C-alpha cells in the first residue's frame, strides 16, 4: 500500500518516459522508468514482472499494471533508511562525506583489518565523480547496486 506520494512519483516518472504519449510503456521503457527512479532490474528480470500480465500488445504495461507491480519489490524493501543511517555512521565528522580515514577507522572498531592500500582502494571504486571522497549519493549506489 504505497503512500500517495509513492504514486505521484511512480507516475510523474512512468509518464516522462512514455514517448508515444498514450498511457502505456514499452519494455525498454519500463526498464528506463525504473532506473531513473533510482532502481534497476536485470536484462531478464525485467520480463517476469511485465511478462506475467500479458493482455496488451503482448509486451506493454498500463499505468495500473505498473502502479500495481510496485509492491512485488516495494511493499517489502524498507532498506533505503538503514543505508542512510549506516552512512551517517561512517561519516565520523559531520562533513556529509565519507573518507578513507573514517572508512578505515570505523572498519576496524567493527573488528576488521584493512591495509592502507585496500582502503584507499575502496573509497576509489566507491567514488564516481573523482572528488576522492564518497557522498551519500555514491554511497547509496555502492550499497544497493548489486
Amino acid at each position: 500500500q504505497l503512500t500517495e506520494e509513492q504514486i505521484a512519483e511512480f507516475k510523474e516518472a512512468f509518464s516522462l518516459f512514455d514517448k508515444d504519449g498514450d498511457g502505456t510503456i514499452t519494455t525498454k521503457e519500463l526498464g528506463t522508468v525504473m532506473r531513473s527512479l533510482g532502481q534497476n532490474p536485470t536484462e531478464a528480470e525485467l520480463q517476469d514482472m511485465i511478462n506475467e500480465v500479458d493482455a496488451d500488445g503482448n509486451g506493454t504495461i498500463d499505468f495500473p499494471e505498473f502502479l500495481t507491480m510496485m509492491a512485488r519489490k516495494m511493499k517489502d524493501t524498507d532498506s533505503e533508511e538503514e543505508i542512510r543511517e549506516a552512512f551517517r555512521v561512517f561519516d565520523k565528522d559531520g562533513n556529509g562525506y565519507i573518507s578513507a580515514a573514517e572508512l578505515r577507522h570505523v572498519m576496524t572498531n567493527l573488528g576488521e583489518k584493512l591495509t592502507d592500500e585496500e582502503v584507499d582502494q575502496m573509497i576509489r571504486e566507491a567514488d564516481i565523480d573523482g572528488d576522492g571522497q564518497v557522498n551519500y549519493e555514491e554511497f547509496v549506489q555502492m550499497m544497493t547496486a548489486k
Binding site: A86, D93, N95, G96, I128, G130
Partner: protein, 735 residues
C-alpha cells in the same frame, strides 16, 4: 595553533638560522606552556617600533618596571610581550651578533619570562609554598643571603620576614625574579651564575626543566578541555532534574559501564519520582491517559481526566476519559482502575510541596476522615483512616466541566497488571536514546556471519557486506507488539535496565516499557533538558535542544558510538504535525551536490501534487512536449553523472568526465528555464537546481586545476548543434 609566526623571510638564513637558534634554546615545554596560555611568538623583520601589525595601542605601558632592572625607552626595543590576555611575544633582529654580549638575548628570556611566570608556579596555582618558600631563601634557609641580583630595590628589605605576611603585595617583584631566574638558567652564556650567586633557584629552574614545565603544561592542557566545554551540570546536581530515582540511576550506572553505551532519558516527572521508589508500576503503551500535577492524585493517571493536568479542557478531558476507557476496554485483565491509596511517606511529600494541606478532621458512617485540602475550586478531597483510600466530590456550589455533579466517591487511578495484581500507574522511564559503542555491536554479530563476509575477494563488496552487517545487527529497528518500535539489542539492553532496577528492590515490574523516542516518528517531542548517563558513570543533563545536539555530536556521534536520530526530524511528523530540527550532515553537503535522476523526478511529482500543474501538460502544444522531452533529457544527464562504471577511469578523469556530464545537465536546465511558461514554482526549483550543479562543478574543479570559475568556463562552450569537439575543447580549457 602554530605558536611561532615568522613575519619576514626577507634575509637568507641568518635571520632564520638565528630565530631558530633562539628557540631551540628555550625548553620545548616552556613553549607548550605558551602555546597553551594561547600565546603566539612573533619574529618580524625590522618593525622595531610600534609597527608590528600587533604592536599598536591596546594594553601597552602604564606603570614602569620593564627590563632586568629598568629603563623604559620603548622605541629602543626589539623584544616585547603584549601583556594583557593571550601572551604575544613580538621580536625582531637586524644583523648577526647576539652571543658576544648576550646581555641582549637574555631579554628574550626575561622579556619572555613575564609571560609564563605570573601564570607559572609563582602565582597561577597560588604562590604555592614551593615558590612561597623559594621566596623565603632571602636569608633564612642556607647561609646564602646572596640575591643582590633580583632584590636590589623592591627587596633590600632583609629586615622583614618574607613568608605570607607580605608576598602578595608585590607579586610582580617576585616576577622580575622568576624572569631573570629563567633568563639566567637558559641564557646561552651565564648558566652557572645562577648556580653560584643563587644556591636554590638553580635547583628550582632545574627541577622545572626536570619536568616542572611539563607540569603546568598539563594542568593547563587538562583545563584546556574542562574549561571551554559544554555546560551540563553533571553529578547529583543533574540527577535532581532527572526525575529518575537515585537507586535506579545509580543502578543503571553499572550497565553503561559493562556494555559501554550512553543512556539518555527524557524527563521523568518529579511528582512520580518517589511513587516509583514507592513501588508504583509505570505507564506503558496501553495507557494514553494524562497524568496530573496537583491535588491528592498527583503522579497518578486519574481514571477521571478532569483530575489530571488538563483540568477544564472540556474536550481534551472529554477525549481524555475516552482514552482510559479503551485502555481497559481493549486491553483488559491487564489494564484497569483501582482506588487511590496514598501511603505514609507520600502524604508528607505532597505536603512540603504544597500540593495538599492536611488539616481538620471529621466523622461519617463511623470512620475517620482527615479531610485533605487543595485549592482546586470544584472538587474537595478527604482521605480515609482504616485504609488510607481517597475520595472527592463536586463542591455544593459548582459542577464538573463535562457537566457532572457528584457526592463522595473514591478516586480510582489507572493500573496495569503486575504478577496478577492491578497496581496503580505513574510516569515511566522513557529513554530518549541508547548509544552503544560500535565495539559493543560487533559483539552483537554472530562470528560465523561476519567471517563469511570478510573472507571475500571483492574489496568493495566486503565493505557492503559489512555495512549491511552493521545495519542488520545494529541499526535496524523492527516493531514489537509489546515494546513499541525498537532494535533487538535496544531490547536486551532494555531488560538489563529493568532487571538492574529490580535486583535492587523495585516491585512494580518494569520501569522502562518501550523503545527510544528516536523511533517515536509519529508523535516526536522536543525536551529541553535530557538526562544522560555516560559509558563510565557520570550523570549529565543538557539544557537546550541544541546543547543536547551539541553534546551528542562531541561525545556520541563523532566518537565511536552508534547513534541514529528520529527519522521525523527536519521533516513534518504526521501525528502532531510538528517540525523538530536536528543537524543532518548529508544535508550540510546537499548545497554542493548534483541531484539524482530520481531525486529530480521526485521534486517534480512534489510540485505537481501542489500547484496542480506539471512541468509538462497532457496536451497537443508541440511546445509542451518540447518541455516534456527536455526534462527527460535532464533526467538523463543527471542519471549519467552517477554512473558506477566511472571507476574504469581515474580520479583526474572522473572529475572531468563528470564536470561535463554535470554541465550537460545544467545546460538543458538553462534551456527549459528560458523555454515557455513553466509555472513560476518550477521556475525557482530549476533556479535552485542550477546553483547546485554550479556549486558541484566548482567543487570538482577546486579539486584539480582551479582558477576557472564555473561562470567563465561556461561561456567558452558551444551547445548549438554539434557536441563532439565541444568536450575536446572543454579538455584543453582545463589544462
Amino acid at each position: 595553533n602554530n605558536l611561532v609566526k615568522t613575519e619576514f623571510t626577507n634575509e637568507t638564513l641568518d635571520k632564520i638560522q638565528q630565530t631558530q637558534d633562539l628557540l631551540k634554546k628555550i625548553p620545548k615545554d616552556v613553549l607548550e606552556i605558551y602555546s597553551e596560555l594561547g600565546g603566539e611568538i612573533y619574529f618580524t623583520d625590522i618593525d622595531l617600533v610600534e609597527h608590528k601589525e600587533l604592536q599598536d595601542l591596546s594594553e601597552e605601558e602604564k606603570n614602569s618596571m620593564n627590563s632586568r632592572g629598568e629603563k623604559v625607552p620603548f622605541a629602543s626595543r626589539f623584544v616585547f610581550e603584549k601583556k594583557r590576555e593571550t601572551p604575544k611575544l613580538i621580536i625582531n633582529i637586524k644583523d648577526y651578533a647576539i652571543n658576544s654580549e648576550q646581555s641582549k638575548e637574555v631579554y628574550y628570556e626575561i622579556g619572555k619570562g613575564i609571560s609564563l611566570d605570573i601564570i607559572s608556579k609563582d602565582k597561577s596555582l597560588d604562590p604555592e609554598f614551593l615558590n612561597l618558600i623559594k621566596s623565603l631563601s632571602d636569608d633564612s634557609d642556607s647561609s646564602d643571603l646572596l640575591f643582590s641580583q633580583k632584590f636590589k630595590e623592591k627587596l633590600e628589605l632583609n629586615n622583614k620576614s618574607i613568608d605570607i605576611n607580605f608576598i602578595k603585595e608585590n607579586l610582580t617583584e617576585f616576577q622580575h625574579a622568576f624572569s631573570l631566574a629563567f633568563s639566567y638558567y637558559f641564557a646561552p652564556d651565564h648558566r652557572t651564575v645562577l648556580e653560584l650567586y643563587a644556591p636554590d633557584m638553580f635547583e628550582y629552574m632545574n627541577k622545572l626543566e626536570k619536568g616542572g614545565f611539563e607540569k603546568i603544561s598539563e594542568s593547563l592542557k587538562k583545563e584546556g578541555v574542562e574549561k571551554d566545554r559544554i555546560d551540563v551540570l553533571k553529578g547529583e546536581k543533574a540527577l535532581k532534574a532527572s526525575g529518575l530515582v537515585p537507586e535506579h540511576a545509580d543502578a543503571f550506572k553499572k550497565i553503561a559501564r559493562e556494555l559501554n553505551t550512553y543512556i539518555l532519558f527524557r524527563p521523568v516527572n518529579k511528582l512520580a519520582t518517589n511513587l516509583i521508589k514507592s513501588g508504583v508500576a509505570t505507564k506503558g503503551l496501553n495507557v494514553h491517559g494524562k497524568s496530573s500535577d496537583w491535588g491528592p492524585v498527583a503522579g497518578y493517571i486519574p481514571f477521571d481526566q478532569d483530575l489530571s493536568k488538563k483540568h477544564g479542557q472540556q474536550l481534551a478531558v472529554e477525549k481524555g476519559n475516552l482514552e482510559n476507557k479503551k485502555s481497559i476496554t481493549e486491553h483488559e485483565g491487564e489494564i484497569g482502575k483501582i482506588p487511590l491509596k496514598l501511603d505514609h511517606l507520600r502524604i508528607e511529600e505532597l505536603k512540603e510541596n504544597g500540593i495538599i494541606l492536611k488539616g481538620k478532621k471529621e466523622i461519617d458512617n463511623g470512620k475517620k476522615y482527615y479531610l485533605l485540602e487543595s485549592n482546586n475550586q470544584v472538587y474537595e478531597f478527604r482521605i480515609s483512616d482504616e485504609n488510607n483510600e481517597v475520595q472527592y466530590k463536586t463542591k455544593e456550589g459548582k459542577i464538573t466541566v463535562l457537566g457532572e455533579k457528584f457526592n463522595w466517591r473514591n478516586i480510582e487511578v489507572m493500573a496495569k497488571n503486575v504478577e496478577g495484581v492491578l497496581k496503580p500507574l505513574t510516569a515511566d522511564y522513557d529513554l530518549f536514546a541508547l548509544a552503544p559503542s560500535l565495539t559493543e555491536i560487533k559483539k552483537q554479530i554472530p562470528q560465523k556471519e561476519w567471517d563469511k563476509v570478510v573472507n571475500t575477494p571483492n574489496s568493495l563488496e566486503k565493505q557492503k557486506g559489512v555495512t549491511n552487517l552493521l545495519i542488520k545487527y545494529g541499526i535496524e529497528r523492527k516493531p514489537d507488539s509489546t515494546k513499541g518500535t525498537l532494535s533487538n539489542w535496544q531490547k536486551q539492553m532494555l531488560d538489563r535496565l529493568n532487571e538492574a532496577v529490580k535486583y535492587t528492590g523495585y516491585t512494580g515490574g518494569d520501569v522502562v516499557n518501550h523503545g527510544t523516542e528516536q523511533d517515536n516518528e509519529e508523535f516526536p517531542e522536543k525536551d529541553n533538558e535530557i538526562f544522560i548517563i555516560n559509558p563510565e558513570g557520570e550523570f549529565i543533563l543538557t539544557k537546550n535542544w541544541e546543547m543536547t545536539g551539541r553534546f551528542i555530536e562531541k561525545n556520541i556521534t563523532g566518537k565511536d558510538y552508534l547513534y541514529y536520530f528520529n527519522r521525523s526530524y527536519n521533516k513534518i511528523a504526521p501525528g502532531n504535525k510538528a517540525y523538530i530540527e536536528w543537524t543532518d550532515p548529508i544535508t550540510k553537503a546537499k548545497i554542493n551536490t548534483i541531484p539524482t535522476s530520481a531525486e529530480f523526478i521526485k521534486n517534480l511529482s512534489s510540485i505537481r501534487r501542489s500547484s496542480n500543474v506539471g512541468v509538462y501538460k497532457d496536451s497537443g502544444d508541440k511546445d509542451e512536449f518540447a518541455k516534456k522531452e527536455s526534462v527527460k533529457k535532464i533526467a538523463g544527464y543527471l542519471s549519467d553523472y552517477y554512473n558506477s562504471a566511472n571507476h574504469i577511469f581515474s580520479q583526474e578523469k572522473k572529475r572531468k568526465i563528470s564536470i561535463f556530464r554535470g554541465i550537460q545537465a545544467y545546460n538543458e536546465i538553462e534551456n527549459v528555464l528560458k523555454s515557455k511558461q513553466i509555472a513560476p514554482e518550477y521556475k525557482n526549483y530549476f533556479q535552485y537546481l542550477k546553483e547546485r550543479i554550479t556549486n558541484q562543478v566548482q567543487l570538482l574543479l577546486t579539486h584539480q586545476k582551479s582558477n576557472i570559475e564555473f561562470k567563465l568556463l561556461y561561456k567558452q562552450l558551444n551547445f548549438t548543434e554539434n557536441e563532439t569537439d565541444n568536450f575536446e575543447v572543454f579538455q584543453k580549457i582545463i589544462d
